[PDB]
């Protein structure tokens, strides 16, 4: 019933300029692959994970 | 939704995540450090 | 109802012993996902001695199964938790408790 308050970290999203999809008559290929390698991660830079 | 993988752990340094997309099924799959991830997304919308 | 899942591995060889103070950071959430406690908000690790019944059973068993440097999720049934009486204001009756515990060091 009462509004709840808590502190939350900001989150941001990053993408390559790669766009692939499926459509009838489409010139695009269907199967795609990519990888992400983690170098540094701070589990708790703030109270929120 | 939890997914089972060998050496299951939260994304840590030196980890490598391999993401695979098949638009025919459709299906999305992952591998962790070359190890299979025992879960998949499928039957999702292809509007975009 | 103590059920431990490993979020991040620890050493795997050093485990808490009775009479040994465990220092942890934790965030407490009910099964529905509402947070009710966090040591990190206060910025002070929580210290408790095993076998003195200071903490609930859920903690007593989970931290014992855990290892130094280990991060884990502990799911605790009400019986091992506060139970039917609950914690007035904080915890409702008959509530399963979900905890994210990082075991810093043993002293």
Curated annotation (Swiss-Prot), chain A:
Similarity remark: Belongs to the ryanodine receptor (TC 1.A.3.1) family. RYR1 subfamily.
Protein name as catalogued: Ryanodine receptor 1
PTMs per UniProt: The N-terminus is blocked.
Intracellular or extracellular location(s): Sarcoplasmic reticulum membrane
Tissue specificity statement from the Swiss-Prot or TrEMBL entry: Detected in skeletal muscle (at protein level). Fast- or slow-twitch skeletal muscle.
Other observations noted: Binding of [3H]ryanodine indicates that the heterozygous channel is activated by Ca(2+) concentrations 4-fold lower than normal. Single-cell analysis of cotransfected cells shows a significantly increased resting cytoplasmic Ca(2+) level and a significantly reduced luminal Ca(2+) level.
Domain of life of the native organism: Eukaryota
Organism: Oryctolagus cuniculus (Rabbit)
Record text about domains: The calcium release channel activity resides in the C-terminal region while the remaining part of the protein constitutes the 'foot' structure spanning the junctional gap between the sarcoplasmic reticulum (SR) and the T-tubule. Pore opening is mediated via the cytoplasmic calcium-binding domains that mediate a small rotation of the channel-forming transmembrane regions that then leads to channel opening.
Role according to the record: Cytosolic calcium-activated calcium channel that mediates the release of Ca(2+) from the sarcoplasmic reticulum into the cytosol and thereby plays a key role in triggering muscle contraction following depolarization of T-tubules. Repeated very high-level exercise increases the open probability of the channel and leads to Ca(2+) leaking into the cytoplasm. Can also mediate the release of Ca(2+) from intracellular stores in neurons, and may thereby promote prolonged Ca(2+) signaling in the brain. Required for normal embryonic development of muscle fibers and skeletal muscle.
Subunit note: Homotetramer. Can also form heterotetramers with RYR2. Identified in a complex composed of RYR1, PDE4D, PKA, FKBP1A and protein phosphatase 1 (PP1). Repeated very high-level exercise decreases interaction with PDE4D and protein phosphatase 1 (PP1). Interacts with CALM; CALM with bound calcium inhibits the RYR1 channel activity. Interacts with S100A1. Interacts with FKBP1A; this stabilizes the closed conformation of the channel. Interacts with CACNA1S; interaction with CACNA1S is important for activation of the RYR1 channel. Interacts with CACNB1.
Region called Interaction with FKBP1A, residue ranges: 40-49
Swiss-Prot record, chain C:
Cystine pairings recorded for this chain: none
Activity control mechanisms: Inhibited by both FK506 and rapamycin.
Modified residues (N6-acetyllysine): 52
Main location: cytoplasm
Keywords: Acetylation, Cytoplasm, Isomerase, Membrane, Rotamase, Sarcoplasmic reticulum
Localization annotation: Cytoplasm, Cytosol; Sarcoplasmic reticulum membrane
EC number(s) from the headed UniProt entry: 5.2.1.8
Residue stretches making up the PPIase FKBP-type domain: 19-107
Pfam families to which the protein is assigned, alphabetical: FKBP_C
Job description of the protein: Keeps in an inactive conformation TGFBR1, the TGF-beta type I serine/threonine kinase receptor, preventing TGF-beta receptor activation in absence of ligand. Recruits SMAD7 to ACVR1B which prevents the association of SMAD2 and SMAD3 with the activin receptor complex, thereby blocking the activin signal. May modulate the RYR1 calcium channel activity. PPIases accelerate the folding of proteins. It catalyzes the cis-trans isomerization of proline imidic peptide bonds in oligopeptides.
UniProt subunit comment: Interacts with TGFBR1; prevents TGFBR1 phosphorylation by TGFBR2 and stabilizes it in the inactive conformation. Interacts with ACVR1B and SMAD7. Identified in a complex composed of RYR1, PDE4D, PKA, FKBP1A and protein phosphatase 1 (PP1). Interacts directly with RYR2 and RYR3. Interacts directly with RYR1. Interacts with GLMN; rapamycin and FK506 abolish the interaction with GLMN in a dose dependent manner.
Protein name (database record): Peptidyl-prolyl cis-trans isomerase FKBP1A
């Amino acid at each position: 019933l009462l509004l709840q308050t808590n502190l939350i970290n900001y989150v941001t999203s990053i993408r390559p300029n790669i766009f692939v999809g499926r459509a009838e008559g489409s010139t695009q290929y269907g199967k795609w692959y990519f990888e992400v390698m983690v170098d540094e991660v701070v589990p708790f830079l703030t109270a929120q994970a | 939704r939890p997914v089972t993988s060998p050496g299951q752990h939260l994304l840590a340094p030196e980890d490598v995540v391999s993401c695979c997309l098949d638009l025919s099924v459709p299906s999305i799959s992952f591998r962790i450090n070359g190890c299979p991830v025992q879960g998949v997304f499928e039957a999702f919308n292809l509007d975009g | 109802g103590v059920q431990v899942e490993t979020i991040s591995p620890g050493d795997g060889r050093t485990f808490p012993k009775r009479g040994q103070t465990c220092v942890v950071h934790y965030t407490g959430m009910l099964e529905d996902g509402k947070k009710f406690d966090s040591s990190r908000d206060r910025n002070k690790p929580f210290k408790f001695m095993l076998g003195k019944q200071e903490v609930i059973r859920g903690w007593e068993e989970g931290v014992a199964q855990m290892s130094v440097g280990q991060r884990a999720k502990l799911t605790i049934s009400p019986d091992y938790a506060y139970g039917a009486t609950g914690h007035p204001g904080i915890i409702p009756p008959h509530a399963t408790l979900v905890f994210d515990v990082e075991l810093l060091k043993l002293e």
